[PDB]
């Protein structure tokens, strides 16, 4: 169930793959394979954990981190207007 993995990362944030599996206690093997498939869509992200042994996977940071209101109110509505 990928929904449990994404919803889980929402409440928390930052956990190795086998660690994320422990949180859901689901199929750690299938859990990790999910973060990868989802990461390809851009709904989740992962970190090259260079200090441990299981990388890291967590929701795509959060939201409003790119389309914040579409940033369509920072160029003056038509100069002079």
The structure's method of determination equals NMR
| Tokens describing residue 76 | 């003056």
| Tokens describing residue 25 | 């206690």
The answer for 12, left when phi > 0, alpha when psi is -120 to 50, beta otherwise, is beta
Q: Which residue segments constitute the domains of the chain, with CATH numbers given?
A: 1-60 (1.10.10.10)
CA distance 24 to 22: 5
> Terminal CA-to-CA distance of the chain, rounded, Å?
52
Torsion angles phi and psi, residue 34, rounded to 5: -75, -55
């Amino acid at each position: 169930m990928k929904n449990e993995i994404l919803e889980f990362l929402n409440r928390h944030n930052g956990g190795k793959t086998a660690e994320i599996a422990e949180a859901l206690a689901v199929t750690d093997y299938q859990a990790r394979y999910y973060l990868l498939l989802l990461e390809k869509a851009g709904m989740v992200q992962r970190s090259p954990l260079r200090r441990g042994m299981a990388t890291y996977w967590f929701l795509k940071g959060e939201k409003q981190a790119g389309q914040s209101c579409s940033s369509t109110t920072l160029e003056h509505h038509h100069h002079h207007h």
